[PDB]
Amino acid sequence: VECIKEITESSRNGKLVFFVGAGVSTLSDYPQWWRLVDKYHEELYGSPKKGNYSSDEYLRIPQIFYNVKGEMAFDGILKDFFQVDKPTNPIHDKILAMNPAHVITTNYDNLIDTACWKRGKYFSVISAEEDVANATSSRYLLKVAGDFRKGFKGENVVLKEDDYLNYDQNYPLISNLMKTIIATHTIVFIGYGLGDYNINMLLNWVRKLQKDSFHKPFFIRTDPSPIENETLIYYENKGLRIIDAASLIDSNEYDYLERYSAVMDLLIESQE
Amino acid sequence: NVVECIKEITESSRNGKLVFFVGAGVSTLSDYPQWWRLVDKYHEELYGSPKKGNYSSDEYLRIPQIFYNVKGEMAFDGILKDFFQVDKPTNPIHDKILAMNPAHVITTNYDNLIDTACWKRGKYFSVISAEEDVANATSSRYLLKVAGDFRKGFKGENVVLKEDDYLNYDQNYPLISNLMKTIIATHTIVFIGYGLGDYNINMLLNWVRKLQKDSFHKPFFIRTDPSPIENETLIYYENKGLRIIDAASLIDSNEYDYLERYSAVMDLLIESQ
Amino acid sequence: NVVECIKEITESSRNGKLVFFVGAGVSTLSDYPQWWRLVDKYHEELYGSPKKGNYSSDEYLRIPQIFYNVKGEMAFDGILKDFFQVDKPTNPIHDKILAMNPAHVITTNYDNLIDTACWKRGKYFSVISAEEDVANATSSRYLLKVAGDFRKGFKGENVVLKEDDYLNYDQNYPLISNLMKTIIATHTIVFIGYGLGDYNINMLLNWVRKLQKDSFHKPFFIRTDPSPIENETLIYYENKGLRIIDAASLIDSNEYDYLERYSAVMDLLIESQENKFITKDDEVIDYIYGKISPLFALQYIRKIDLKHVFE
Amino acid sequence: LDNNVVECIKEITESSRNGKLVFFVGAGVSTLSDYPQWWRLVDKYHEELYGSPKKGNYSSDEYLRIPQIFYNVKGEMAFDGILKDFFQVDKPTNPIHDKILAMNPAHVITTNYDNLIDTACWKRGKYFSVISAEEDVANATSSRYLLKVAGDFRKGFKGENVVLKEDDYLNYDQNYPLISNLMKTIIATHTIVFIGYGLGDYNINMLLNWVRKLQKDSFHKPFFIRTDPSPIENETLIYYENKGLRIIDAASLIDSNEYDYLERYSAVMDLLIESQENKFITKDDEVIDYIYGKISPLFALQYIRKIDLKHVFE
């Protein structure tokens, strides 16, 4: 009951920030990225993936589709799948009820963005580098991968593998500013599994932080399998406190929203 | 133009987006021991006699680092207590800066001369000295001591003074490094208390050329040097991102009339608002 | 093409400028226990039994590190001492590698198989496995075991296996990276037994991007996979600095028969060196010329020395 | 030569006969050949920039940053024009260059950007593969390197080819990624004698900042020849010996003029050459040291011919 208290304890002080991931941009029925990787496969090779493709998703096929297939043609398919519109899930309604001071997100839609002005809270979107200094408020929104706000082109969204190495060089301020928000506030994660690109790239950055010098983050597991005794004790050392929805409600193998809205209802009921 | 620089500094003063990157020359006025003095006592207690003329590069930039390894740590902090355990008054400069309503005050100085001046007025800045202070803060308003404070004690582990600590600083203070360059892009920076050719000035311009073409609020340089700035040096440091404001171009003063040149550039900021 | 790659591997073998980069895909033609059989054993002391699921990589990387943290470092050492005290033979690939006459052999392997094949011929190789052996070396031919080796203990500290060992490789082993990278820029590097996605290959291709345009020679990648390569993947990796000789694009074999593909390239290199393809009778008036056109700068050559000219 | 000098030359000469000695030549060896110095171009780039020559008492921050200012303000063709006026000379070879090459080194690394060690090697007739740029490591003609780590002027008297500005020393590990790595292979695998430096030079400090990162005993400590006018201070000798330098002091072997640098270079460099003829066996338990060093390998054999032992004792 300690971890359910401190999240609400930071809510009254207004020192709470959320980290928002792609396990939530499927409950609003926005396209998962491997639908593109499926298309990236069959427009480069010529025939679909009858077998299980391995080391192509975030690895080899979007990168090769940018330069072998064509540069403007990489964004010709991006506008074909991301000039869409999808309805806001209750998770974007349930998170905002906890009054986040900022929201960091690796997602690149306008679906955490269509939930904010449709409530009445003012966040300024810092998604690119000309957005960092040029800001309108101290209550700013941080999209670390980008968004299509400047246009429907490839160089505004981090998708290839020629962008997940020189992200700490081509986007230098956002990468600095994201670390700053972790350093003052308290960070809550959502929609990730243990072992993405960005849960390990941050806890490699956390090893470069000294002892008793940061707030240990909040990572809620919404995978319908239970938590092991082993994998739990491992990620206690890398810095993570785990609140498990799977140890809270018994749900189906595909009842995702029954697990995501479970812990969100566990917070808002514990607000007062 | 000198007017155009003030209209932006006053605009960030009115909008609350003004931060003064505090130098050491604003604390050399208050009779606080300048660091060339400690280099002498580290030189004289180690080589027996002091060196005449000018110091060598391994004897000016490395002679405390030679002193710390050869002599030790109890005798290294034995000298730091002898010069820095004093009581001093604040400048008239320490009255014009806090009255410009700063958001954050970023210092390089290891003394409570810009710090106790805040406690005299109603401005409440939180001293960020150690690495714990970013998460243990109780404010959104920060006194970012990027070099350290003697608040824990008179030990030399708390201030970056040696030669390996201008190199192990990115490994022993990683968030304060991240928190400083946050404020440089968001807030507007004014450099008061340095000279072009200082160490910590040229590290920031290295971080400047890493950034994009128009990604930052290109800061201002308040030159309190006795000489006038040369036109060649003016174009060079400005193209690296430092709008130079010189006291010697505005007023004419003597070769040791420092505090007038320190105050007159701040007289064009208090009277302008 | 295959044919120009055949030449540049041969006439770099005749100059003391050929270095192989030997992987785990030819230690198991000599049938040495693979690493996925270890991580199945580590999965059974921590968990019950491996419900496989085709091994998503987030378990495939962490499971040696988890049993390291929980059980103790003593148990991590004896399991290696269980699975790797096996005393296996040498395949014909090792004999064909050394008959291609290497200056050095770099290897990601923690076995002792290539050193024993190097001891059995008339050439000595200075084994470097640890960090200390760089200065206390012997004779400028190096068997460079960049992943560590069990030549001084079956403890887990000597070899890099975990995930605290991949990201601390530049800290713990600074001199074994510098000597690995010096051989690559100098010599002609051929890879043996990798699969184009590897922590030992993609960490090399990121260092090669940091170099200039023509400041290096492009390494050769002998690829032995059962399904042949596609042209676009051959475009992407030739653009990154790998000249890939594919073994499936020269012979045809079953999807489980490896030694035929590994030898169809190595016989193609050695029998190019040991000259077996000479026809049309104007190919003999430039094999003999290339051995005698140096000797036009001498007025007379002893007839006992012309046997050493023609090898 | 009481204890440290006779133990240092017992290691340098025991690496010279193994082909495992590498000399690291600085600018204070080519300054003896009166080749123009780099103070003479900062003051030149001060007077074409600030109008008048500087007074002196010169700050280091106005030293390193001024030839960049002559580049950023006066352009590029002005920068490499004065290099064609103060470096485009012919100078002769001094006899420390011959005393280096008499030691038969495996490599020679240099921070010099003149071809004076490069004209002292075709004069004596020594074939070094000269690596001055990055495109010369994969095109090495021999196994024996003349590695000019700060560049050279063989492709022309342009500043693209030599490290001189202050934007060059911050892009050294990204514009020269293979010269820097080949140098540290030589420091790891050979015995390094430094000659021509001053214990606070930028190269020697940026090379002892690398050897701290290495393990506690992986490297051998490089040697250092100090030819400074004043005797070395034992606080300075304690500091660099706990950092990766054995310091042979030339001002504690002879005693010559405060402005005659040639005597102190020639002191140690003639002491090393003459010390290959052993002259170390003067104690009766040092005679038995030498003889055990030649014979006790042959205990693996069971009998030796008496005419084979003329080959054992050289």
Residue B26's SS3 state is helix
> Which residues lie across from D146 on neighbouring strands?
D108, D130
Mutate to test the interface with B, among A167, A176, A205 (most CBs of B within 10 A): A176
Rounded CA gap, A201 and A193, in Å? 13
List the Cα angle A11/A263/A240 in 5-degree steps: 75
- Hey, what's the torsion of the CAs at D121, D122, D127, D133, to 10 degrees? 70
CB D249 within 8 A of CB D229: no
CB C161 within 8 A of CB C188: no
Residue B105: closest CA among B187, B205, B185, B25: B187
What's the Cα-to-Cα distance from C113 to each of C82, C165, C176, rounded to whole Å? 17, 23, 20
Q: Which amino acid is at D163?
A: V
Whether C and B touch (3+ CB pairs < 8 Å), yes or no:
no
> Is the alpha carbon torsion for A252, A254, A255, A259 positive or negative?
positive
Minimum-distance CB partner of C66 among A55, A64, A234 = A234
> Is the alpha carbon torsion for D183, D184, D190, D192 positive or negative?
positive
> Is the alpha carbon torsion for D303, D306, D311, D313 positive or negative?
positive
Residue A218's SS3 state is strand
Residue A161: closest CA among A22, A36, A71, A58: A58
Residue A176: closest CA among A215, A136, A129, A216: A129
Neighbours of chain D (3+ CB pairs under 8 A): B, C
CB D130 within 8 A of CB D118: yes
Size of interface A-B (CB pairs under 8 A): 59
CB D157 within 8 A of CB C103: no
Resolution in A: 3.0
What's the Cα-to-Cα distance from A126 to each of A15, A95, A105, rounded to whole Å? 19, 19, 11
Which residues of chain A have a CB within 8 Å of the CB of B186?
Answer: 132-133, 135
Q: CB burial class (10 A; 0-12, 13-18, 19+) of residue B132?
A: middle
Rounded CA gap, D142 and D121, in Å? 14
Phi, psi (deg, nearest 5) at residue D247: -110, 110
Q: Which residues of D237-270 are buried (b: 16+ CB within 10 A; e: fewer)?
A: bebbeeebbbbbbbbbeeeeeeeebeebbbbbbe
Nearest-neighbour CA in chain C from A255: distance (Å): 21
Experimental determination approach used: cryo-EM
Q: What is the DSSP string of chain D?
A: --SHHHHHHHHHHHHHTTT-EEEEE-HHHHTTTT---SHHHHTHHHHTTSSS---SS--SHHHHTHHHHHHHTT-STTHHHHHHHHS----PPPHHHHHHHTT--SEEEES--STTSSSHHHHTT---EEE-SGGGSTT-SSS-EEEETTB-SSS-S-TTSB--STTTSSSHHHHSTTHHHHHHHHHHHSEEEEES--SS-HHHHHHHTTTTTS-SSSSPPPEEEE--SSPPPHHHHHHHHTTT-EEEEGGGT----TT-HHHHHHHHHHHHHHTTS-----SHHHHHHHHHHHHGGGGSSS---TTSHHHHT-
Angle between the N-to-C axes of helices C35-46 and C57-71, in degrees from 0 to 180, rounded to the nearest 10: 60
Which residues of chain C have a CB within 8 Å of the CB of A195?
Answer: 56-59, 62
Q: Which amino acid is at A19?
A: F
Size of interface A-C (CB pairs under 8 A): 39
- The sheet with strand B220-223 has its strands ordered as B126-128, B142-145, B105-107, B18-22, B188-192, B220-223, B243-246
CA atoms lying within 13 Å on the CB side of residue C25: 21
Whether A and C touch (3+ CB pairs < 8 Å), yes or no:
yes
Which residues of chain D have a CB within 8 Å of the CB of C173?
Answer: none
Nearest-neighbour CA in chain C from A19: distance (Å): 21
Under an 8 A CB cutoff, do B57 and D200 touch? yes
Whether B and A touch (3+ CB pairs < 8 Å), yes or no:
yes
Minimum-distance CB partner of C232 among A68, A165, A228 = A68
Rounded CA gap, B150 and B139, in Å? 21
Rounded CA gap, B153 and B157, in Å? 9
Q: Which residues of A36-65 are buried (b: 16+ CB within 10 A; e: fewer)?
A: bbbbbbeebbeeeeeeebeebbbebbbbbb
Which residues of chain A have a CB within 8 Å of the CB of C232?
Answer: 44-45, 64, 68
Residue A41's SS3 state is helix
Q: Cα-atom radius of gyration of chain A, to the nearest Å?
A: 19
Closest-CA residue in chain C for D179? C182
Nearest-neighbour CA in chain B from D166: distance (Å): 12
Rounded CA gap, C25 and B211, in Å? 44
Nearest-neighbour CA in chain A from C304: distance (Å): 58
Under an 8 A CB cutoff, do C46 and A230 touch? yes
Residue B229: closest CA among B269, B193, B268, B195: B195
Q: Which residues of D164-176 are buried (b: 16+ CB within 10 A; e: fewer)?
A: bbeebeeeeeebb
CA atoms lying within 13 Å on the CB side of residue B169: 17
Rounded CA gap, C135 and D187, in Å? 9
Residues 6+ apart with CB under 8 A from A9: none
What's the Cα-to-Cα distance from B110 to each of A10, A74, B96, B148, B258, rounded to whole Å? 32, 54, 21, 5, 22
- The sheet with strand A241-244 has its strands ordered as A124-126, A140-143, A102-105, A16-20, A186-190, A218-221, A241-244
Residue D64: closest CA among D90, D39, D101, D89: D39
Minimum-distance CB partner of C135 among D184, D213, D219 = D219
